[PDB]
């Protein structure tokens, strides 16, 4: 407002004039355009001359964050006790039970239902019921943790029963 502006100038899209040979060794290395042609990859961090100098600078400056992470871990390590985490021990016949049930039934290596003399082992994707690796480590750890928590609860119950018996003996003995 306040002035009758002319239409948008054609200078808003300047015509690019090729002053250099478009080398075939730079094929598609440039986004070609008649207005503002560009290199296919933009380097805003060009203050790092190379990618090796960039890696050196990144690892030199990331050392501060390594130190800060170490400080945070030490603070939480000298001031916090590991928690009682694991699978729900009230349902062990579920996720843990199904894993060992599948590894126990071995239904993937049975005989063919038509007598075709081929079992599950005759495939590129074949069952292996004696593998003992992979997620089995985590499954064993979860089962051990569940057993440990059950043992802790049992020990607590035994302790309270022992305390009650000791109190009954103490009060009854004195008379």
């Amino acid at each position: 407002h306040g002035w009758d502006r002319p239409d948008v100038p054609l200078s808003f899209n300047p015509l690019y004039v090729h002053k250099r040979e478009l080398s075939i060794f730079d094929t598609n290395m440039w986004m070609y355009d008649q207005v503002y042609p560009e290199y296919v990859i933009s380097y805003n961090e060009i203050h790092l001359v190379d990618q090796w100098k960039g890696l050196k600078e990144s690892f030199s400056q990331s050392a501060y964050w390594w130190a800060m992470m170490a400080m945070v871990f030490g603070f939480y390590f000298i001031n916090t006790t590991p928690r009682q985490l694991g699978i729900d021990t009230n349902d062990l016949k579920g996720f843990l039970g199904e894993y060992y049930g599948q590894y126990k039934k071995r239904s993937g290596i049975r005989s063919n239902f038509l007598g075709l003399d081929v079992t599950g082992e005759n495939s590129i994707i074949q069952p292996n019921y004696d593998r003992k690796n992979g997620i089995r480590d985590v499954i064993d750890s979860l089962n051990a943790d569940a057993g440990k928590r059950k043992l802790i609860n049992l020990e607590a119950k035994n302790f309270i029963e022992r305390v009650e018996k000791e109190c009954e003996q103490r009060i009854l003995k004195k008379g």
């Binding site: 002053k19 250099r20 040979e21 478009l22 080398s23 060794f25 730079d26």
Partner: peptide
């Protein structure tokens, strides 16, 4: 090999349509 960033005169002898 790579393109030359230097400004060059337009070619006089080049393959054409």
């Amino acid at each position: 090999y790579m393109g030359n960033p230097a400004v060059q005169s337009p070619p006089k002898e080049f393959f054409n349509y």
